[PDB]
Amino acid sequence: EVPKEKEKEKVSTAVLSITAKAKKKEKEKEKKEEEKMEVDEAEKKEEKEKKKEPEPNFQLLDNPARVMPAQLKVLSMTETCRYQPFKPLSIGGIIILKDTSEDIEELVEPVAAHGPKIEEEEQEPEPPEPFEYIDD
Amino acid sequence: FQRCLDDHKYKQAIGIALETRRLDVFEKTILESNDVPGMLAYSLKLCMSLMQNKQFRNKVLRVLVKIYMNLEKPDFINVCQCLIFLDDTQAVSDILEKLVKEDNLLMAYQICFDLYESASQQFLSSVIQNLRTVGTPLKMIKILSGEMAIELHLQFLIRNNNTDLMILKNTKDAVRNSVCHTATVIANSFMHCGTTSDQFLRDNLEWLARATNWAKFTATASLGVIHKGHEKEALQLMATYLPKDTSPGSAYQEGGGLYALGLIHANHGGDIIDYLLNQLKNASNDIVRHGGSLGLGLAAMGTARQDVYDLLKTNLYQDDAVTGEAAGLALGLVMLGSKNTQAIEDMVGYAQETQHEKILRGLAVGIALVMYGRMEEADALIESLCRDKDPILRRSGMYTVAMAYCGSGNNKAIRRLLHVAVSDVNDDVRRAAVESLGFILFRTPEQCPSVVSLLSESYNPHVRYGAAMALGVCCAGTGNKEAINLLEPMTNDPVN
Amino acid sequence: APAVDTAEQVYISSLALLKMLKHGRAGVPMEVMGLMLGEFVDDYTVRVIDVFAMPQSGTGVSVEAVDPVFQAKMLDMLKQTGRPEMVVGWYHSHPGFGCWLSGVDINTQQSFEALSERAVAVVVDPIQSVKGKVVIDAFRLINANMMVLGHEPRQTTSNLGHLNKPSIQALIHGLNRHYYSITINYRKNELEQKMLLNLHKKSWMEGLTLQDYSEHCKHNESVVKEMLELAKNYNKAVEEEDKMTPEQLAIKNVGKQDPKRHLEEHVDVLMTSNIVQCLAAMLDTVVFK
Amino acid sequence: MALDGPEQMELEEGKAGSGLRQYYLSKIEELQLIVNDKSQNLRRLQAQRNELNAKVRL
Amino acid sequence: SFLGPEPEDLEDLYSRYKKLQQELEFLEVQEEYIKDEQKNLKKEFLHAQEEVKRIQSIPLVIGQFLEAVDQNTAIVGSTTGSNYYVRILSTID
Structure with missing residues (x-):
């Protein structure tokens, strides 16, 4: 997170305790006829820090791949979620039978790259996009 | 087997067939199993797990590729496993030639994109010439080289990228950078892999100059990984540091700029290989030559050429200290995955000849790469190295077995590493041996925390460093519960 | 800086480790020193081919300890055998302090330092070093002013640490500041080892x-x-x-x-x-x- | 199947093939014995070693 | 009579067992070496013992043992007429 930002917020919280404390103490409840003491009006100060949350979720083993029982769609050349290391089987699932990529065999697509046919079906537009363009 | 044939289960068939060791039997004695995904893939792993005998395994894998090749749909998974494991041209060539008949242009591409990630990088170059003859449905070349392929992965890496510079800024700004300099550059180099973070490097030019010694080399060197497969920015960044454009700073910075260049363009080497080749001839001296030597070997993978081997071999003979280390690694990279007697000879013999420490380490890893998927043939080599007079040579044997045996986990390989470790009190051999185990065992990764624990208990904290490593590699794609807890007391220990 | 300055591992031959120890032991309790003769290879390997001792005295491990008579005389012998060597650095024993440099050691360490940035002061096990398994470490000594400039971190890089305390935290502070226990490896081959293993020929009869x-x-x-x-x-x-x-x-x-x-x-x-x-x-x- | 229940045929009927499974399981039963004693023996040496380590580190 | 899928399930029991047996064979090799590892640890030990031996030798002061309060630390009176609470090297009996 970086500390720099965190210091700024700690000082801003403090201003509040100082201001309430100031007025309240000043009122004489021990030099008027009534005495209920002015020492009971002893407040203290506060600050604010923050640090990243630790929370282990979807852990079968400490750092498997974190197996979800539920699936989502991810686009080629993207993790819309964030993918997890080493699942050859859980990537591919069943290829979608409405997409412009479909094929002759199902689930022949691990995270080692594959390019399915468009002979089988064409529907959705094809997007080619290397970094070739950016390089040269 | 006939009761089994009658039930019509392929899964039962491979298991029994295995026991018998007969090829016709594995396919089904009269062919009736035609499922292409699932059960078929399972056998290949089964044959590897139980058996430790290559010859029969290579025959089974190969027979299974040909029987499916006759079928209209072959699978791309089955040829990729043979291709790495056998180090045989045939498996991929057989399926792609049938594909000509089909004129599924599309099918051929799918196999090729797959081939590049999975298979040996060096091996792909030899495969290209033979595929052209059998015929394709040429267009194949761009993907198999890896030029096209790498560029598509770069759009993936860059868009998703998220990881800030800010951590690096605070420490560098606060106090003088020399030791801190090393710390910044490796963390920085690794995080921004395949994305544009040239931003930091370019303004904080001053950052690299303040450094000294090896840290200095490491700083310029670090850049290449960040700019992996950017052909745009790669040349520009490296220029400052090179005598190409002013303010080179020192020899360390120039050497590191060549190393970075070799890293960026590796595995599709085009225009860059010829410049670094000329530079190799020309300089042939210490700190500058180290990076150039290293890069040259990397650039050569995935296009091949003999010329790179000879030049690294002459460079090694001359007895330059710094560059010798790079030379050794690079000889192992070029020849790779076929076995070459010259490569193994030159690196092994040279170790004995030099008393210079940098050169030694470099060779020791180097002999290991070229032996990749030899299996049993590596045994004779590790034993010799271990038998040798020098303690450094004993470490070089451990490398040899580590690379070769992967893709199996066998009894044979483990027994000799351990042997070295007990016989010798010596701190280096014990630590060395423990790492190599974790690689052999990652084909049943659960075994590794049990064996590594025993060794960590020892009096030498040296062994413990290796113990940490052994676990890491084994579990590196996906791990276990046990692997993490073993590592955890060592993190707390105050031995550095 | 285009400066080298780093930690230097010492590659000790078998004649050189046994000989240095012998001197150190003979020398107790008076502090005794001697020169390391060698060749430099690589860019941090300083190799001690051989060693000789400067005489045992109550004035040693001082610039006064090094004699021109003994050094020259010793060098001249080597020539007839035809061995060319350079003065790679110096070794010493302190048997009234640990395997750290002491105050008396500093003057000598400085002169050799200025001459060769690749001359080190090696403390060799005598019998006083509490943490002594024959742990030999080589250090260079700088001052505080140099450290804040950032000369100090360069020296520390590229070595494997190890903690000692044979004389309390004051030793440790100097130990970290120096290089911090530099790794020593030994150059040997199998033939030399075997000669050291057997007590005598006579075991054959005696057994x-x-x-x-x-x-x-x-x-x-x-x-x-x-x-x-x-x-x-x-x-x-x-x-x-x-x-x-x-x-x-x-x-x-x-x-x-x-x-x-x-x-x-x-x-x-x-x-x-x-x-x-x-x-x-x-x-x-x-x-x- | 079981280690019980006689039935006719074996040529391709398949009761024999299942019956062989019950014998295949006898083979693992032979093997389970070697393995437990190997774990116990390794453990014996580890106890002794852990005890030796503790002195040196200490 | 069988022609069902049941021989697949029966196969699995055997298939899992064979890989598990293989893991154990790795452990067999390790059992032989671990007996050797002890012998090496004893070698390291003996060299490590030389380290305690240096403190055990001069310079030494002579004291007199008042009594042992516990194993790891005790109460002693040195020959100075000053008493110190000090540690026992490797729990002397």
């Missing part, structure tokens, strides 16, 4: 050699008598004597002059001697007769 039978028979008799005494003490003990703490055990299971231990020592010595003495005599008799 076979037996005393007098009468004396062997006496040994057996002496132990038995000894064991017989301990026996009474074992008998009460057996009821527990698996317990922690010797103070508690003293009353319970006769932990005062522990019978288990006494009996085990008596049994080990008796055993090995009787078999070896029987075996030898009997084997020799069949070959000779």
